[PDB]
Every structure is written in C-alpha cells, then in structure tokens.
Design a protein around this ligand. Sequence first.
Ligand SMILES: [Mg+2]
Ligand SMILES: [Mg+2]
Ligand SMILES: [Mg+2]
Lengths: 324, 325
Amino acid sequence: PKNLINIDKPIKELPASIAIPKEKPLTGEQQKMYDEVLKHFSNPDLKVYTSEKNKSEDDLKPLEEEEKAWLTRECFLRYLRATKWVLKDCIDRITMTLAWRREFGISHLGEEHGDKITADLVAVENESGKQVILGYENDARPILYLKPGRQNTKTSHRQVQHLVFMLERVIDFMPAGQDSLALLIDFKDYPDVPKVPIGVGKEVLHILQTHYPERLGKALLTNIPWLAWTFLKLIHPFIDPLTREKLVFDEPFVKYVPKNELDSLYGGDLKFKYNHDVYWPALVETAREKRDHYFKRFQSFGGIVGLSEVDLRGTHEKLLYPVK
Amino acid sequence: PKNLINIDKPIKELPASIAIPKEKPLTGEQQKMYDEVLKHFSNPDLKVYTSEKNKSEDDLKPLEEEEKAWLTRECFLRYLRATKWVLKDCIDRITMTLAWRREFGISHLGEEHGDKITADLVAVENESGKQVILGYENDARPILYLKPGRQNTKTSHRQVQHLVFMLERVIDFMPAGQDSLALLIDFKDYPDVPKVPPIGVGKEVLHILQTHYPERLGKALLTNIPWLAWTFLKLIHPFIDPLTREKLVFDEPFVKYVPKNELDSLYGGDLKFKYNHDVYWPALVETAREKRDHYFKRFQSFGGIVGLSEVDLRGTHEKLLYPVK
Ligand SMILES: [Mg+2]
Ligand SMILES: [Mg+2]
Ligand SMILES: [Mg+2]
C-alpha cells in the first residue's frame, strides 16, 4: 500500500517538471495567411452577427473589448489549422464562433463582465462531480475528467450550458504555451449517485466541431463496458493514424500522465474525493484569478486583437510575440 | 394508417423480392492460392490440434466428417480475404479455428452430432430477447438484433457461449449465396427487464470475433445511442477507413438498409414483433436444425468432401454449381 497525496482542489499551476511542447514554425505562405486574418479582425469598423442561430446581415454589433481579448494569435491558428489554411473559411468560422459565443452567453470572458452563463447557474450540474478539472498530463495539457456514470440531472439545456462552462474553465487552466486539453473518460457506473427530453448530442456535436476546433489533444478511456470495449478495439486500427494517436482505449493512464498529476482510481498518486462545497468554489476562484490576470495583461499591452496566449497567460515583462 | 404484420418467429427463407448479390468471380492468381488451400485441407492424412488455447504438436486428431462439411469453398475464401491472400497465414488461421471450434464445443455442426454447446445450455441467456435472429436486409444478409439494454444475466462464460451459439444460428440462416450477416444494435435501456446487481467477457469475445469469424460482419446498424457515445461516434466517423465506414451506420433510418416487411416496427419497419421466449426460441432451434440437416445431407450426397460450396450445400439444385477440382 503506497502513500498517496491528499488533494481536494484543482492544481493551479503547471509544475516545472512538465515541459511545454514547442510550436511548429509557420511556412512563408502560412504567415501571409495569418496576417490577413489579423488584418480582418483588427478592422476598427468590423461588425459581427448578434447570434449564430438567428444570424442576419442586418443585425450586427462591433467587437467588445472582451472579444478582442479572445481574438488571439493562437485562436487564429486553431481555426487556420481546422479549416486547412483556407482564408475565407477561417474568417467565417471565427466570425460564427464570435456570433455563437454572444448567443450562448459567454462572449464577455466571465460573469464578472456580464456572461449569462454563471457558476451559480451550472453548479448544481457538477454537484456529484461528474466533471473534474484537475492536474496536467505529459504534454502540459490540463486534465478534464468526464464521469457519465456519476450523472445526477435529467437531460436539459442546462446540461449543455454546464458542459460549455467546464470547457471554458479547463481552457482558463491552460499553461502559457499550450492550448489543447486532455479528456480522461471513466465509463463506470457509480451507484452512490441517485439517477434521475431532446437528447443533447446534436447540439454538443455542433458546439464541439464548430466552436471548439483544435482543443482535444488527448482522450483517455477507461472502465469501458464489454460491448463498447469490443467495438472500440475492433475499429481502432481503421481509424486515421493521426486521430488514432490522440485516442487511447483502455491502456494505463500512467503512461500519459505523471503519477502525482493523476487520480489514484486510475493508477495515480492523487487521493481525490470530490467534495462540492470545497472543490467548486476553489475552481471558480482559481479560474477567475486566471482570467483577471489574462485580461489585465491584455489591457497592459494595448487591448488589441492578435496578442499571444503565451504572453496573456505568461508573466514576462515584454512580449514574446509582438503584433505586426 | 399503419397496418403492421404480426410475427413472433424467425423468418425461414429469404423472400424472392431480395436478390442475392453476385459474387466477384476469382482471378487467375487467386484461384492458384485457393487450390493450394483446398489441397492442404484435402489431405487425407491431415491431423489438427485438439484445442487452440492448449495447442501442441503432440496432441493432434484427424478431420471429422462434420469438420469437412465446415471446410467449404467460401470458408476458404473468407480466410483468404482476411489474411490478405497470404497462403501460410490462411492455412494457419483456418487450422486454429478448427482447433478452437473443438475446444469451445461447436465442432460437430450441431448438438445432434455431439456439440457440448446446446440450445438448452444457453436458452436462459435469450429469455428476455437480448438477441433476436429475424429477417433479411437489402443484400440478403440475415439480421441479428443485439439489445444490450435487455441484459438479464450476470457476467459469466455462459454469456460468451450464448453469443457464439447465436452467431452460429444466424450463420445457419444464410441464404445460399450469402455468407455475411447484418447486426442491428439498439442501445436503449429497457427497465421492464430485471437487471442483475467477475471477469469482463470483452477480451475473449474480441479474440473470438477477430480470429474465428473473419469476414462475417457485412453490416452494422446502430440506433438509440446515448448522447455521449452518439457524439463520440459522430466525432470519429469521418476518420474511419472508407471500406469500413460504409459498413457502419450510426443513427440513420434502418429503412434505408432493410425492406420494411423484414424490419421490426420499433425501428421504422412493418414487423409487429414482441419477443415471447416459449414461442420464439423453440422455433429458432427447430428452423436452424432443419437448415443444418439439409446442409449436412446435401454434403453427404455430394461425396462428403472438403471444398464443397455453401451455395450448393444450402441450395436445392440437383447439380453442383461449384464442382470440386
Ligand atoms: Mg440577429
Ligand atoms: Mg435463410
Ligand atoms: Mg470462420
């Protein structure tokens, strides 16, 4: 019996023991395309749709300060890679995500600035700890645990709102220099949690594919029921090699996560029991700290579109990536 | 307006409204390898391992009559396609499936010839209708429904025995000219079935399907998928290899792939089917037995040799369509 590490709150900072991967350098034509996107969203006269769902050319609103802070160098790069470096597609996708973010109630970088999705709104959804932000894996990705066997609410739109909220918070926890997350999915049934319309799948799929490009860096799956397990194993080789590498179906998590960063349930050193009244306020306060820092940094650098997340999340006095 | 067709038993014969897809005839170089497989398994002094798991060169037994009946032209082709037309792999794979069939208790083509896996042994596993053999789809494949939400037993080796048994029964239902099946999987939870409150069967089942049932899954239709799995299956769908992707259908109407008169009404068909074990099960057992009897007597009438075709063994024409070299 090993000696585990007590923990009941999210790990605030990436430990120094985990290095941040180096970014792939951009070809000449890629930089040129990047500059066009930068130019498009730097336009002082830019106006975008008030929603995605009900978008109209005749109902537009110029960018808010908070939207400029979201429109980062890496945001541009995520969409460029998602759209396979097609300039018009990149611009439209970004535009539509801005549009969706206003509609959904998350365009203001936090409830502190007017977001309608609040911590208090979705807190009940996390009551049984069905989603947990905790730790960092080998490539400095923040970890999001998903535990559908701990489901505590009935299907509703609020489930989607919680889903999006937790995604935004795990993004708040990104270390400077990283912009993708790791999903750790535990499919076990937990009877300890009492089990309680339109299936939310379609909306969640639309949200993940359309508004969260290039965010899934790793997905680790464990405690898979037999039929699902068999299915996943039968199809794994037929999955495209570059997607295949991102997906791990029932292998030890310890090979992708350092032990002191991993829950002991899955072979790690962390002794974690979800305690809502302790965990939830810690996550909310920690996420808020990160956002305050990020936004202060953004204003200190001119409050312009195109700033780097490396700089906005970092602490160096001078910009590592100055804006053209 | 809705007028459904009453049914409570397996449909015995492919309707004539469904064509059997034409086989792609063998090339010149493929025939050559095939003949080598036939020659190997035609050897009258051939001896095979008595099990896969505990295989030994010093524990061998000759081919039984019933095993020669299993060693068909199409059996050879299934392995040839599976092993990418590598002769040594093909022969070895076939050999190990024969060995596993003996080990597992299904080497005799039915309990009537001494199979330890019997209808009575596994019947309790089907009591709530978690697996149902019923109907034929657009390409004449017999349909096997999987309904994991109706699980009625505790995890055990018997569950594997039942899975194999049902697979073997759906193969008995192959129309002459077809050798792949269609899986219709409904993931919905049926609370009306009492759920039992212990090693997972996945590793064994995976090994069995991959190693011992090559080229059997012609089609899988998935429906009533919970949101999370649904999103996953959609998120990964395009990244699946094309030839495998068209094989898999994730939450699309079954009516595109199955004629309505061959399809359960619950999935948009015209068959009003309610699973009644004391009616369904005996009828499944009887019909499969009839099909096996016909298959085996046909085998005997054509010489009782290795390499006969399933088209002839399941068919009724007086002359062989595939005489053996
Ligand atoms: Mg509008
Ligand atoms: Mg038939
Ligand atoms: Mg086989």
